[PDB]
Amino acid sequence: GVNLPARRVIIRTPIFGGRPLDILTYKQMVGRAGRKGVDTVGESILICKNSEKSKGIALLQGSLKPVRSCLQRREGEEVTGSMIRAILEIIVGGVASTSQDMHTYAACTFLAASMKVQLGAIEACVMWLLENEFIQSTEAGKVYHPTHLGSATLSSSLSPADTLDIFADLQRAMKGFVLENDLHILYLVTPMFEDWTTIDWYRFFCLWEKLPTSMKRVAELVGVEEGFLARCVKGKVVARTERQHRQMAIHKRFFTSLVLLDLISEVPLREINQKYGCNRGQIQSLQQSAAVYAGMITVFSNRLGWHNMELLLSQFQKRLTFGIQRELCDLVRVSLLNAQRARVLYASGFHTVADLARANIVEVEVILKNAVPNMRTIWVTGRKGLTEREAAALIVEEARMILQQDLV
Amino acid sequence: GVNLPARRVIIRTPIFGGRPLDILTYKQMVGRAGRKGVDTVGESILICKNSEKSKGIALLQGSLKPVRSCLQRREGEEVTGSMIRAILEIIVGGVASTSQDMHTYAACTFLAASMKVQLGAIEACVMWLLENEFIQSTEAGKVYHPTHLGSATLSSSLSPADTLDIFADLQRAMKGFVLENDLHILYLVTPMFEDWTTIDWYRFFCLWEKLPTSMKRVAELVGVEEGFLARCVKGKVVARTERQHRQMAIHKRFFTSLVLLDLISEVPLREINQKYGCNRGQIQSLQQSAAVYAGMITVFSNRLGWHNMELLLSQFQKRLTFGIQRELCDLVRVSLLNAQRARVLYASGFHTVADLARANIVEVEVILKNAVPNMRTIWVTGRKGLTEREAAALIVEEARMILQQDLV
Numbered sequence: 001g002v003n004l005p006a007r008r009v010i011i012r013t014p015i016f017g018g019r020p021l022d023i024l025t026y027k028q029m030v031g032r033a034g035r036k037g038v039d040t041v042g043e044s045i046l047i048c049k050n051s052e053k054s055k056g057i058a059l060l061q062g063s064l065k066p067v068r069s070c071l072q073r074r075e076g077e078e079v080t081g082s083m084i085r086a087i088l089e090i091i092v093g094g095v096a097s098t099s100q101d102m103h104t105y106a107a108c109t110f111l112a113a114s115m116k117v118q119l120g121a122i123e124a125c126v127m128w129l130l131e132n133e134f135i136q137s138t139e140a141g142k143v144y145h146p147t148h149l150g151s152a153t154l155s156s157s158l159s160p161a162d163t164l165d166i167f168a169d170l171q172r173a174m175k176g177f178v179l180e181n182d183l184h185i186l187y188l189v190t191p192m193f194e195d196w197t198t199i200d201w202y203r204f205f206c207l208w209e210k211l212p213t214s215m216k217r218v219a220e221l222v223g224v225e226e227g228f229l230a231r232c233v234k235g236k237v238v239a240r241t242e243r244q245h246r247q248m249a250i251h252k253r254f255f256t257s258l259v260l261l262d263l264i265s266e267v268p269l270r271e272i273n274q275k276y277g278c279n280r281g282q283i284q285s286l287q288q289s290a291a292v293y294a295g296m297i298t299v300f301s302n303r304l305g306w307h308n309m310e311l312l313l314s315q316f317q318k319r320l321t322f323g324i325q326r327e328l329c330d331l332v333r334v335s336l337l338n339a340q341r342a343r344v345l346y347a348s349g350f351h352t353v354a355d356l357a358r359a360n361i362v363e364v365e366v367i368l369k370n371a372v373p374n375m376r377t378i379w380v381t382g383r384k385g386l387t388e389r390e391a392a393a394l395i396v397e398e399a400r401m402i403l404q405q406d407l408v
Numbered sequence: 409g410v411n412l413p414a415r416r417v418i419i420r421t422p423i424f425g426g427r428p429l430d431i432l433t434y435k436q437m438v439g440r441a442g443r444k445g446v447d448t449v450g451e452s453i454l455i456c457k458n459s460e461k462s463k464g465i466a467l468l469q470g471s472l473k474p475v476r477s478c479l480q481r482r483e484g485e486e487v488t489g490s491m492i493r494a495i496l497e498i499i500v501g502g503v504a505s506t507s508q509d510m511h512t513y514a515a516c517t518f519l520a521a522s523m524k525v526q527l528g529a530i531e532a533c534v535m536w537l538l539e540n541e542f543i544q545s546t547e548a549g550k551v552y553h554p555t556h557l558g559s560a561t562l563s564s565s566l567s568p569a570d571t572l573d574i575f576a577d578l579q580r581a582m583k584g585f586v587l588e589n590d591l592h593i594l595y596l597v598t599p600m601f602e603d604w605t606t607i608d609w610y611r612f613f614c615l616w617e618k619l620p621t622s623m624k625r626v627a628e629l630v631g632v633e634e635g636f637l638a639r640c641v642k643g644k645v646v647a648r649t650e651r652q653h654r655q656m657a658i659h660k661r662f663f664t665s666l667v668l669l670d671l672i673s674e675v676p677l678r679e680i681n682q683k684y685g686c687n688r689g690q691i692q693s694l695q696q697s698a699a700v701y702a703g704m705i706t707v708f709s710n711r712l713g714w715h716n717m718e719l720l721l722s723q724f725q726k727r728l729t730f731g732i733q734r735e736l737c738d739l740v741r742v743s744l745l746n747a748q749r750a751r752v753l754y755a756s757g758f759h760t761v762a763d764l765a766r767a768n769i770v771e772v773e774v775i776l777k778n779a780v781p782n783m784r785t786i787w788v789t790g791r792k793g794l795t796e797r798e799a800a801a802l803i804v805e806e807a808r809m810i811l812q813q814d815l816v
Contacts, residue, residue, distance in 0.1 A: 131646060238539060242650045 009033040009044040014056045021055075023062045071111040071121075078124045081161055087125040091135050092146040092154040099141060102126070134160055148304055156300035162192075163300075170301065170309065178221065180214040182264065185312050186257045187222050189294040189320070193252040196289075197282045201232040204255050207275075211258075223250045259283065260290055263323045264316075266339060291321040327351065333402055336380055336395045344371035357399035364392035413443040417452040422463040431470045479519040479529075486532045489569055495533040499543050500554040500562040507549065510534070542568055560711035564704045570600070571708075578709065578717060586629060588622040590672060590724075594665040595630050597702035597724050601660040604697075605690045609640040612663055615683075619666075631658045667691065668698055671731040672724075674747060699729040739764065741810055744788060744803045752779035765807035772800035 009032055014021055034042025048056035070082045086109075090096035096105045102122050106112060126144065129135045134150035137143070146154070149167065153160045170188060178184045208229055211219070228251060231237060239245045255276075262272050269280045278286075294317040301309040315326065322332045324339045330352050331342040348367045350356045356364075369388045372378070376385030386394070417440050422428060429437075442450025456464035478490045494517070498504035504513050510530050514520055534552065537543045542558035545551070554562070561571040578596065586592045616637055619627070636659060639645050647653040663684075670680050677688050686694075702725040709717040723734065730740050736750040738760050745753065756775045758764045764772075773796045780786070784793030794802070 128648075131648075240536075240539075246651070 004032060005035045005038075006032060007035055007039050007043060009042075011044070011046045014046060014048055014052045014059055021059055023059060024064055026059045027064070067110075068114070069110050071109055073117070073121055079121065079128055080125075081159055083121055084125045084128060084160055087122065088129055088134060088150065088160055089154060091126075091129070091144050092150045098143055099123075099126070129160070132160075132164060134163075152300050152303035155303045156296045158296050158300060166297070166300065167304075170297075170306065173221075174306065174309065176221065178214065178218050180217070181212075181261075183215045183257060183261050184218045184221065185316060186260050186264070187218065187254065189290060189297055189313060189316055190253050190256045190260065191286075191289045191293045193249060193256065194289075196256070196286050197278050199252060199255055200277045201229065203275075203277060204251075205229045205233050207258070215258075215261075219254060222254060223247075224254045225251075256286065256290075259286065260320065263287060264319055264325075266323065266325060266343065287320060287323060291317055294320050331356065334395055334398050335382070336391060336398060340372075341368070341378075344368065347371070353399050353402055357396060357403055359396055359399075361389075361393050361396050364395060365389055368392055412440060413446075414440055415443055415447055415451065417441040417450075419452070419454045422454060422456055422460045422467055428463050429467055431467060431472055434467045435472070477518045477522060479517060481525075481529055487529065487536055489567055491529055492533045492536060492568055495530060496537055496542060496558065496562060496568055499537070499552050500558045505551055507531070507534070537568070540572060542571075556712055560708050563711045564708035566704050566708060574705070574708065575712075578705070578714065581629075582714065582717065584629060586622070586626050588625070589620075589669075591623050591665060591669055592626040592629065593720055593724060594668045594672065595626065595662060597698060597705055597721060597728070598661055598665045598668055599694075599697045599701045601657060601664065602697070604664075604694050605684075605686045607660060607663055608685045609637065611685060612659075613637045613641050615666070623666075627662060630662060632662045633659075664694065664698075667694065668728065671695060672727060672733075674731065674733060674751070695728060695731060699725050702728050735759065742803055742806050743790070744799060744806055748780075749776070749786075752776065755779065761807050761810055765804060765811055767804055767807075769797075769801050769804050772803060773797055776800055 009030055011021070011026070011029060016025075030044040033044045046056050046059065070080060071086070073080045073083070086105075087102060090102065090105050096102050099122075103119060106118055106122055109118075111118060126135070129150070130137055130144070132149070133147045134153060135144045135146050138145060149163070152158075153163045156163075158166060173184065173188060205226075208216075208219075208226060228237075228247070232251070237248065239248050259272060259276055259278060262275070263283065267275075269283055272278060272283055273280065294313065298310050298313045298317065301313065315329065318324075318329055318332065319326065322328070322339050322342075324332060324342065328339060328342040328346055331337050331346060331350070332339070333353055334342075334356065337345065344367060345356060345364070348363075348371070350359055350364075365388050368378070368391065372388075374387060376387060378386045378388065378391045380386055380391065417438055419429075419434070419437060424433075438452040441452045454464050454467065479488060479494070481488050481491070494513075495510060498510065498513050504510050507530070511527060514526055514530055517526075519526060534543070537558070538545050538552070540557075541555050542561060543552045543554050546553060557571070557575065561568045564571075566574060581592065581596060613634075616624075616627075616634060636645075636655065640659070645656065647656055667680060667684050667686060670683070671691065671694075675683075677691055680686060680691055681688065702721065706718050706721045706725065709721060723737070726732075726737055726740065727734065730736070730747050730750075732740060732747045732750065736747060736754055739745055739750040739753060739758070740747070741761055742750075742764070752775060753764060753772070756779070758767055758772075776786070776796050776799065782795045785796055786794045786799045788794055788799065
């Protein structure tokens with residue numbers, strides 16, 4: 001993640017996560033030994049048990065694997081999502097219009113450069129995009145053009161195998177959308193689960209009893225079922241079939257949307273932790289991936305022309321990223337303001353960036369000095385810590401500059 | 409299906425349905441040559457082209473394949489539906505309780521006699537039934553007992569792999585059942601599609617316009633979608649995934665339920681043929697499988713205790729078997745009466761079997777003599793053709809006997 005120099009790098013065991021340590025990770029770990037321009041030498045100690053020792057020596061003497069890219073379809077695969085995405089991007093973008101061009105493109109891949117089957121993989125990917133009509137075939141050979149369902153995947157950056165599920169889910173929402181709360185909007189922008197946390201199903205079912213009626217109404221629409229939650233409480237649930245994989249994913253996705261609903265209502269991370277069991281960094285790493293996904297789904301609906309969906313969803317990318325009520329969404333345009341600092345300026349009465357740009361800097365200082373509880377009390381992710389006087393002056397001047405940029 | 413002895417059995421080609429004949433079928437054909445006690449010798453001619461002579465001689469000289477059981481799980485199969493049903497039937501019936509008994513039962517199987525892997529096949533089937541709790545494991549080794557879902561799937565004679573879909577479909581119907589017409593019931597008792605006809609999708613979508621709103625409301629509930637009908641009209645549609653397989657099955661199952669709804673309302677087979685394209689024998693064979701399946705779904709709901717479903721479903725086995733309105737269902741208890749003859753007796757005023765048993769035989773004769781339009785006018789499937797006087801007398805005496813049997 002970050003370059004930190006250290007003199008002594010200790011690795012407590014050659015085994016990580018129940019696996020032997022990856023040589024790439026080990027060389028990244030050990031490569032941080034030695035404080036540049038301060039140490040005479042760097043030191044690393046792999047602490048190793050007598051039973052581990054053969055693995056430990058393998059880490060010291062081993063060297064990185066050659067690169068081999070995902071465009072190789074494995075045994076029993078006729079297509080790969082990276083290749084499908086590749087063929088989509090060139091057809092829908094229009095830079096490869098014909099099968100003669102698609103072979104000419106594929107010869108530029110690192111797969112071709114590594115081989116220097118692929119001519120079959122191209123055709124199999126074309127066939128998948130065609131049968132679902134991400135692309136359409138016209139007679140010249142064949143000339144392939146996108147549909148609206150194709151062009152939307154390229155603009156959204158959504159994976160097209162997921163796009164069939166996203167597309168049908170959004171249509172089924174529009175057939176009957178619960179505007180009564182933001183939970184139905186949230187559910188559609190929740191990511192696929194990807195094990196962002198270990199769900200405590202006995203907590204989740206005991207929340208489901210308390211869950212507001214207008215949120216259980218969403219749950220029945222999206223497909224949650226309280227008998228299956230009780231079956232998760234009763235014991236281990238396993239999915240053998242793609243039907244069962246989809247059935248289970250809905251409940252994990254709904255639990256995620258409840259965490260986000262607390263997150264976009266400024267519920268403190270300590271209270272979310274106590275209520276759902278999540279760690280702070282799990283909630284924040286969920287928050288980033290949901291905010292990214294909320295962007296994709298907006299552009300996807302806009303390209304299709306679901307104008308009433310893009311109105312609702314567009315607010316949520318910013319609103320998820322900071323995790324704020326609807327009113328703070330203006331203030332946060334000042335990058336010095338997080339949800340905490342925006343709420344204290346909003347609480348005082350600086351409801352909008354234009355009013356904040358008018359503000360007397362001494363008043364912003366006194367608001368921050370009082371509301372937050374020298375010594376660089378405030379942290380700004382692009383800076384070292386700031387004093388109240390310095391942060392307030394930079395806030396006002398940044399708000400004015402935003403007006404200057406917005407008017408220009 | 410019949411003993412018809414013929415003096416010559418000509419077979420027009422060695423190829424049938426685009427394949428060589430099965431030697432079992434060919435010997436079932438040729439074995440019909442020679443009329444017992446009439447002929448001196450039977451004859452069969454396989455007509456064969458010069459291109460086919462090698463296939464022809466192979467049918468003449470070839471001999472039947474050894475019989476081999478379905479319980480041999482193939483490569484890539486962990487379980488087979490036949491073995492699962494075998495293990496279910498003994499556990500839910502209670503004739504095998506422990507794994508010691510299940511290995512003992514398997515030694516009685518023709519699989520074992522043919523071998524004389526299977527000990528693993530038993531355990532894999534037990535694990536499927538356990539994970540879905542068709543059976544519940546308990547600590548003694550393990551002792552396995554049925555659930556209600558096991559006992560219902562056994563008593564229904566349904567396949568247990570399908571029973572997970574049937575159970576979830578029936579529950580989802582009970583959350584919101586359209587009583588406004590019998591189509592939502594017919595969608596639940598109609599079998600899964602079995603290539604009983606080739607659907608003309610341009611006809612089907614041209615019906616979907618005219619379909620009554622009380623029946624399009626069912627279609628929305630069951631999951632039929634007019635955007636997917638348009639794809640079927642637009643061109644070929646295929647299933648790459650289990651999601652796509654059921655999405656197509658739902659539409660084929662709805663089309664089948666409309667054909668049944670016309671049968672259930674006594675729409676003539678010629679009018680059904682013109683309206684849907686089915687042959688008479690396709691419709692009449694669909695009646696048999698739908699009436700069998702309507703019986704299974706009743707017993708399934710009865711054992712689970714869905715008393716409101718079995719109260720609705722239980723009319724449909726008889727009603728589908730004959731293809732009658734609700735009122736004929738009493739008269740039809742007379743096995744001499746089909747839907748045609750029941751409707752002429754109901755139209756005259758013999759609304760019930762007790763009132764038919766009272767009838768003057770000469771009056772039943774005159775009704776049949778008039779209403780049906782002595783050369784054996786009436787065909788009775790258990791008999792040669794009958795005259796009006798003979799059929800009417802047998803009808804009245806059979807109605808009286810039914811009272812005697814019902815009172816006894």
